Design an enzyme around this catalytic site. Structure first.
Site, PDB file in Angstrom:
ATOM      1  N   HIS A 197       0.804  -1.264   0.000  1.00  0.00           N
ATOM      2  CA  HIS A 197       0.000   0.000   0.000  1.00  0.00           C
ATOM      3  C   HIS A 197       0.816   1.283   0.000  1.00  0.00           C
ATOM      4  O   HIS A 197       0.752   2.096   0.927  1.00  0.00           O
ATOM      5  CB  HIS A 197      -1.017   0.000   1.126  1.00  0.00           C
ATOM      6  CG  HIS A 197      -2.138  -0.995   0.927  1.00  0.00           C
ATOM      7  ND1 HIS A 197      -2.188  -2.183   1.582  1.00  0.00           N
ATOM      8  CD2 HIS A 197      -3.245  -0.962   0.094  1.00  0.00           C
ATOM      9  CE1 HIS A 197      -3.289  -2.853   1.197  1.00  0.00           C
ATOM     10  NE2 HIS A 197      -3.927  -2.113   0.279  1.00  0.00           N
ATOM     11  N   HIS A 206       1.348   1.579  -5.868  1.00  0.00           N
ATOM     12  CA  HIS A 206      -0.025   1.053  -5.901  1.00  0.00           C
ATOM     13  C   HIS A 206      -0.991   2.110  -6.394  1.00  0.00           C
ATOM     14  O   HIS A 206      -1.751   1.875  -7.352  1.00  0.00           O
ATOM     15  CB  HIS A 206      -0.430   0.513  -4.524  1.00  0.00           C
ATOM     16  CG  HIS A 206      -1.868   0.082  -4.442  1.00  0.00           C
ATOM     17  ND1 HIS A 206      -2.411  -0.821  -5.301  1.00  0.00           N
ATOM     18  CD2 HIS A 206      -2.894   0.491  -3.587  1.00  0.00           C
ATOM     19  CE1 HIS A 206      -3.718  -0.992  -4.991  1.00  0.00           C
ATOM     20  NE2 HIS A 206      -4.021  -0.177  -3.956  1.00  0.00           N
ATOM     21  N   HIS A 228      -6.697   7.128  -3.029  1.00  0.00           N
ATOM     22  CA  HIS A 228      -7.581   6.183  -2.344  1.00  0.00           C
ATOM     23  C   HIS A 228      -6.948   5.396  -1.226  1.00  0.00           C
ATOM     24  O   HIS A 228      -7.671   4.803  -0.437  1.00  0.00           O
ATOM     25  CB  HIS A 228      -8.245   5.228  -3.356  1.00  0.00           C
ATOM     26  CG  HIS A 228      -7.388   4.046  -3.702  1.00  0.00           C
ATOM     27  ND1 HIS A 228      -6.367   4.124  -4.571  1.00  0.00           N
ATOM     28  CD2 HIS A 228      -7.377   2.760  -3.193  1.00  0.00           C
ATOM     29  CE1 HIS A 228      -5.746   2.926  -4.634  1.00  0.00           C
ATOM     30  NE2 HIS A 228      -6.368   2.096  -3.796  1.00  0.00           N
ATOM     31  N   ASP A 229      -5.611   5.377  -1.130  1.00  0.00           N
ATOM     32  CA  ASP A 229      -4.909   4.704  -0.029  1.00  0.00           C
ATOM     33  C   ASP A 229      -3.972   5.626   0.764  1.00  0.00           C
ATOM     34  O   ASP A 229      -3.083   5.155   1.466  1.00  0.00           O
ATOM     35  CB  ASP A 229      -4.142   3.466  -0.565  1.00  0.00           C
ATOM     36  CG  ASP A 229      -5.004   2.195  -0.592  1.00  0.00           C
ATOM     37  OD1 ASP A 229      -5.849   1.992   0.317  1.00  0.00           O
ATOM     38  OD2 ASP A 229      -4.833   1.395  -1.534  1.00  0.00           O
ATOM     39  N   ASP A 276      -8.502  -0.933  -8.358  1.00  0.00           N
ATOM     40  CA  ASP A 276      -7.833  -1.358  -7.132  1.00  0.00           C
ATOM     41  C   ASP A 276      -7.233  -2.766  -7.204  1.00  0.00           C
ATOM     42  O   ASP A 276      -6.219  -3.033  -6.575  1.00  0.00           O
ATOM     43  CB  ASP A 276      -8.816  -1.297  -5.952  1.00  0.00           C
ATOM     44  CG  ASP A 276      -8.131  -1.015  -4.621  1.00  0.00           C
ATOM     45  OD1 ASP A 276      -6.881  -0.830  -4.565  1.00  0.00           O
ATOM     46  OD2 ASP A 276      -8.857  -1.000  -3.608  1.00  0.00           O
TER      47      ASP A 276
HETATM   48  C1  LIG Z   1     -10.587 -13.410   0.386  1.00  0.00           C
HETATM   49  C2  LIG Z   1      -9.381 -12.484   0.495  1.00  0.00           C
HETATM   50  C3  LIG Z   1      -9.497 -11.089   0.650  1.00  0.00           C
HETATM   51  C4  LIG Z   1      -8.352 -10.285   0.728  1.00  0.00           C
HETATM   52  C5  LIG Z   1      -8.497  -8.775   0.905  1.00  0.00           C
HETATM   53  N1  LIG Z   1      -7.315  -7.991   0.485  1.00  0.00           N
HETATM   54  C6  LIG Z   1      -7.432  -6.555   0.862  1.00  0.00           C
HETATM   55  C7  LIG Z   1      -6.100  -5.821   0.586  1.00  0.00           C
HETATM   56  C8  LIG Z   1      -5.579  -6.031  -0.838  1.00  0.00           C
HETATM   57  C9  LIG Z   1      -5.611  -7.524  -1.175  1.00  0.00           C
HETATM   58  C10 LIG Z   1      -5.098  -7.893  -2.533  1.00  0.00           C
HETATM   59  C11 LIG Z   1      -5.021  -7.033  -3.638  1.00  0.00           C
HETATM   60  C12 LIG Z   1      -4.508  -7.515  -4.856  1.00  0.00           C
HETATM   61  C13 LIG Z   1      -4.414  -6.642  -6.045  1.00  0.00           C
HETATM   62  F1  LIG Z   1      -3.233  -6.864  -6.674  1.00  0.00           F
HETATM   63  F2  LIG Z   1      -5.376  -6.952  -6.955  1.00  0.00           F
HETATM   64  N2  LIG Z   1      -4.088  -8.787  -4.981  1.00  0.00           N
HETATM   65  C14 LIG Z   1      -4.187  -9.562  -3.875  1.00  0.00           C
HETATM   66  N3  LIG Z   1      -3.844 -10.849  -3.711  1.00  0.00           N
HETATM   67  C15 LIG Z   1      -4.144 -11.186  -2.429  1.00  0.00           C
HETATM   68  N4  LIG Z   1      -4.664 -10.130  -1.758  1.00  0.00           N
HETATM   69  N5  LIG Z   1      -4.669  -9.147  -2.721  1.00  0.00           N
HETATM   70  C16 LIG Z   1      -7.044  -8.045  -0.968  1.00  0.00           C
HETATM   71  C17 LIG Z   1      -7.099 -10.910   0.638  1.00  0.00           C
HETATM   72  C18 LIG Z   1      -7.039 -12.292   0.479  1.00  0.00           C
HETATM   73 CL1  LIG Z   1      -5.466 -13.130   0.340  1.00  0.00          CL
HETATM   74  N6  LIG Z   1      -8.151 -13.042   0.412  1.00  0.00           N
HETATM   75 MG   LIG Z   2      -7.454   0.587   0.439  1.00  0.00          MG
HETATM   76 ZN   LIG Z   3      -5.859   0.220  -2.915  1.00  0.00          ZN
END
Ligand SMILES: Cc1cc(CN2CCC[C@H](c3cc(C(F)F)nc4ncnn34)C2)cc(Cl)n1
Ligand SMILES: [Mg+2]
Ligand SMILES: [Zn+2]
Ligand SMILES: Cc1cc(CN2CCC[C@H](c3cc(C(F)F)nc4ncnn34)C2)cc(Cl)n1
Ligand SMILES: [Mg+2]
Ligand SMILES: [Zn+2]
Lengths: 327, 339
Positions: free
Chosen positions: B78, B82, B118-119, B230
């Site tokens: 973050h 990003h 946004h972050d 995002d």
């Molecule tokens: C079901 C679930 C929800 C989340 C929520 N998480 C919030 C913060 C960003 C995160 C994220 C963001 C992204 C992004 F690159 F698209 N890729 C990701 N690969 C694993 N998490 N992850 C998602 C993470 C995981 Cl491993 N699994």
């Molecule tokens: Mg965020």
């Molecule tokens: Zn974000």
């Protein structure tokens, strides 16, 4: 010359780990054990001859990771442990116990870090000589022992009666042959029946079978120590195995899974070995000798440790370096 | 001071000069050096005609962009890159999907500026952690929820309320009100809990057909687009997605370590001793990311390749999962690691 007591206070206990003794002092420990068992006196063994024999035997081992002189030494030490803790003099003749100890010293002589099947697959000279009678490497080990005994200054049975000399040669051959796990798996039912009917010290056949079980028990005795030993041993065994698997791949052959470093899963392989081969051996030993209970219990605990540590063979979280670059 | 001077006086460079494939869904904005990213924001704003359409004062815009960049810290995931890559994807959607048939100009501008902001000031920990750690941010916002997202919005507003940084300063009262309202809705939409709450409303919108005269459809669509930006790291190639996994889990496991140290059991995905990365990524792709890009494809036929890349990236986790099991011995030929 030296008394066992001076080597270590714990030398004659099942808890002692003979791989802890430095390799430069192992030949002295062989003499110390033979003296302690009083074979040198009983059979009037020339000590200079015995010394030269012991050194030749040691020099006759190569240096693969597992099947080396320290293995032979630790196998022999276990034999001494059995004699000391189980009091084998009540169950076996003195010459049988002595032959067992000398067999332990010699049982893997000139091992090249490959199994029998590889010798045959690769059409080694040892396979040309022995493949038709089976147990290729074990026949070689015995032939190496014979060559040692017939080297000038090394025939520790020089002075024996013809009956005893011959009994010693016959015992060493049968005991060394018994170190092939194929042999053990073939006699496994006979070993069980002997334990049911009950060891008959007047039964010459029961002597033969007990000697086979005891030899196997010595060959696998690394598994009767603590975790630290079992972990190190697996390290050594699998480096040796994978090295043969690599050679078989260069030959255009598919190794058995346990020798294939790309396919081997060590915890499964070890657990299966422990559960299906090692445990039944020491279970049979425990049935025959109540004082061998602790050996079986260590083998079972070491097996249970492998299950407890199996999860560590899957990467959880990230690697220490915080990268997935290994992919 | 010197960074500002060049942004202001050197001129806004043409977007094509950034990279031949800069406007393509295949381009990975994370390959742009961080030192070139503020100028790239200006080139994107220019190319979308926002600078001229909204008569944005260039000195103000330059100060705003640098201030936004300066308002990100450097956790593994973050961080500014990003926010930059998310903003880039918004630009990509504008260039590739014809948003002008769906949203008002001010709405598209609001989405982009929201992506930048946004972050803001993310500290590498999630909403649950602010509550559990009794943080200042939870003290302010926990009774309203979306704690971090409210903080990101408040930070963006504070930048705009910094002298010389109000890029909207000349807007009419109504337009200014509108922008700040859009920024609030969009930035709050980045809480995945909100997304999951509106997911069935997004499906219903996609089924019945997008109605440009329906104000609620505009709102819903802005949320989905923001969520799409995002998570957009997952629409690139395998190499990007693997690196992104490294960053996420470094950040997550750091939080989980803190959670253990204050006596709480972290979630499996935060716990470096329980987390099995391939399975977690597969679940995240199946339950979170794939449905989002499926919706986007349903609404925009030219978004198909995005979903197909997300679905392919989910398949790679299955293909690579066997390599997380140690076969044979480790390279050092030791089993030391068992004790
Ligand atoms: C079901 C679930 C929800 C989340 C929520 N998480 C919030 C913060 C960003 C995160 C994220 C963001 C992204 C992004 F690159 F698209 N890729 C990701 N690969 C694993 N998490 N992850 C998602 C993470 C995981 Cl491993 N699994
Ligand atoms: Mg965020
Ligand atoms: Zn974000
Ligand atoms: C079924 C089977 C047989 C073998 C045969 N192998 C012959 C060479 C010695 C070897 C061995 C010897 C010992 C000894 F230390 F007890 N421990 C062992 N742990 C695993 N193998 N292994 C046994 C090995 C395995 Cl992993 N599995
Ligand atoms: Mg052998
Ligand atoms: Zn052996």
């Amino acid at each position: 010359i030296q008394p066992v007591a001076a080597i270590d206070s714990n030398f004659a206990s099942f808890t002692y780990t003979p791989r802890s003794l430095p390799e430069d002092d192992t030949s002295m420990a062989i003499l110390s054990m033979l003296q302690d068992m009083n074979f040198i006196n009983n059979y009037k063994i020339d000590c200079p001859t015995l010394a030269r024999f012991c050194l030749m035997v040691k020099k006759g081992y190569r240096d693969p990771p597992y099947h080396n002189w320290m293995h032979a030494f630790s196998v022999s030490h276990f034999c001494y442990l059995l004699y000391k803790n189980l009091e084998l003099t009540n169950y076996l003749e003195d010459i049988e116990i002595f032959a067992l100890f000398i067999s332990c010293m010699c049982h893997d002589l000139d091992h090249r870090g490959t199994n029998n099947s590889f010798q045959v697959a690769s059409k080694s000279v040892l396979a040309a000589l022995y493949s038709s009678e089976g147990s290729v490497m074990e026949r070689h080990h015995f032939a190496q022992a014979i060559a040692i005994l017939n080297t000038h200054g090394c025939n520790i049975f020089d002075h024996f009666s013809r009956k005893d000399y011959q009994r010693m040669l016959d015992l060493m051959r049968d005991i060394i042959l018994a170190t092939d796990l194929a042999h053990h798996l073939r006699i496994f039912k006979d070993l069980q029946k002997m334990a049911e009917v009950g060891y008959d010290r007047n039964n010459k056949q029961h002597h033969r079978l007990l000697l086979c079980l005891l030899m196997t028990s010595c060959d696998l005795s690394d598994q009767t120590k603590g975790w630290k030993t079992t972990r190190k041993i697996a390290e050594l065994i699998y480096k040796e195995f994978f090295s043969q698997g690599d050679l078989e791949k260069a030959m255009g052959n598919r190794p058995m899974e346990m020798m294939d470093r790309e396919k081997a899963y060590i915890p499964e392989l070890q657990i299966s070995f422990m559960e299906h081969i090692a445990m039944p051996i020491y279970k049979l030993l425990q049935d025959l000798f109540p004082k061998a209970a602790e050996l079986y219990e260590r083998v079972a605990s070491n097996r249970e440790h492998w299950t407890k540590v199996s999860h560590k063979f899957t990467i959880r979280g990230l690697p220490s370096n915080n990268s997935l670059d290994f992919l």
